[PDB]
């Protein structure tokens, strides 16, 4: 079975060097060129470059020329993508794929690279105070690193009408997410709403009560 297997997810800081790998099996690695493809979160596929592993002939997209080094060690059926100085904007998924008579018929599973200047940091939790007799309320889970955080409402007893959004990685290198819940308007004040936010990497547990604005 023809496969390309990539190295695991990386979490690095701007300026650090990184070399990720793409290992071929089930075929003669030296006989087919390996391309590298970037995919930034939510965006399209971008060709970065390509290498002929037999003779190490390498070509790059003008956008990536001088920013990255593609190399190969055909003796161990492995192609590499290398940065001497990661940028925060290098945060993306990276795929390798072989140019075959069926081009890019076989792809690696992808390597996620996260580049952030942040150290481990627990989140600040801020209340988001409260349509057909229902009210939306929530918690802003701001400025944490790394992923993930977990959110529950009223210790897990409130699950109806809850949506916890995916996190955004901000330009500061820190994550933020929100969790919202839709509840009856008549229950406000009389019924207490607490978001429970856990961030294991920093051993952080925060309970924040969310109460009505009252204007």
């Amino acid at each position: 079975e023809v496969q390309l297997v990539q190295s695991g997810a990386e979490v690095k800081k701007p300026g650090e060097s990184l070399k990720i790998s793409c290992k071929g099996s089930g075929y003669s690695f030296s006989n087919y060129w390996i391309g590298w493809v970037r995919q930034m979160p939510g965006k399209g596929l971008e060709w970065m470059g390509i290498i002929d592993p037999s003779n190490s002939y390498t070509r790059y997209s003008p956008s990536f020329q001088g920013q990255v080094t593609i190399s190969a060690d055909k003796s161990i059926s492995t192609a590499y993508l290398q940065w001497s100085s990661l940028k925060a904007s290098d945060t993306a998924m990276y795929y390798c794929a072989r140019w075959y008579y069926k081009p890019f018929d076989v792809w690696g599973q992808g390597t996620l690279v996260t580049v952030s200047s942040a150290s481990t940091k627990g989140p600040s939790v801020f209340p988001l105070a409260p349509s057909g007799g229902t009210a939306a309320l929530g918690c802003l889970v701001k400025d944490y690193f790394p992923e993930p955080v977990t959110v529950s409402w009223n210790s897990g007893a409130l699950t109806s009408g809850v949506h916890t959004f995916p996190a955004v990685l901000q330009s500061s290198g820190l994550y933020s997410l929100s969790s919202v819940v839709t509840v009856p308007s008549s229950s406000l004040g009389t019924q207490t709403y607490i978001c429970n936010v856990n961030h294991k990497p920093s051993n952080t547990k925060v309970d924040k009560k969310v109460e009505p604005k009252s204007c």
């Binding site: 069926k102 890019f104 792809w107």
Partner: protein, 216 residues
């Protein structure tokens, strides 16, 4: 500067037929190079769907077909299924500065449920955040379909692009979509403008919510 042009989005109902165009210049398709197509399901590596203009790898259903006439390549999908919902990319070798080029991609939506306009909730900065010397406006976007929105922020009436972060829509438990957008401000920035607006565009229609510092 060789470019492959794809429509940003196509849609069809289950059982119907869609086509996705991929048009090139003369470095890519004009020189006579073959076009190939890739399917990328959410959270997965791309998968070869069509190679050499029209050939199917084994395992690819005959519902998928491709053609290329001059500088124009096209992917057709007949008998649309919900598993066909994905991003689709065309690609080609070229004679230009880039040996390989991908098209910008096409999001295919299989319209298996009715269109629903988004519900927008805009939260002003909390007291707690303001006493921490920060201010974040939180625009929550709920109960929409298809799962694609455009968000624009306004200070008074002027567009603001700095300090904006927006999530890619994902499914709610009720199978509609939700997204979030954030505007980060200094408390001074928040206080100095009369109002701020979150404008959400969905299927050509815009729904907007507005918050003001002076209001409650």
């Amino acid at each position: 500067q060789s470019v492959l042009t794809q429509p940003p989005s196509v849609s069809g109902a289950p059982g119907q037929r869609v086509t996705i165009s991929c048009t090139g210049s003369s470095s890519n398709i004009g020189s006579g190079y073959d076009v190939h197509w890739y399917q990328q399901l959410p959270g997965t590596a791309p998968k070869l769907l069509i190679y050499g203009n029209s050939k199917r790898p084994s395992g690819v259903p005959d519902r998928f077909s491709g053609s290329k006439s001059g500088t124009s390549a096209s992917l057709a999908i007949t008998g649309l299924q919900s598993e066909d919902e994905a991003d689709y990319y065309c690609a080609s070798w070229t004679d230009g500065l880039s040996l390989v080029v991908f098209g910008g991609g096409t999001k295919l939506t299989v319209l298996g449920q009715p269109k629903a306009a988004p519900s927008v909730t805009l939260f002003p900065p909390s007291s707690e955040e303001l006493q921490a010397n920060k201010a974040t406006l939180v625009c929550l976007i709920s109960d929409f379909y298809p799962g694609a929105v455009t968000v624009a922020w306004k200070a008074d009436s002027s567009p603001v692009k700095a300090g904006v972060e927006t999530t890619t829509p994902s499914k709610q438990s009720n199978n509609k979509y939700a997204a979030s957008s954030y505007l980060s401000l200094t408390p001074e920035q928040w206080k100095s403008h009369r109002s701020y607006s979150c404008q959400v565009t969905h299927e050509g229609s815009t729904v907007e919510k507005t918050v003001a510092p002076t209001e409650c």
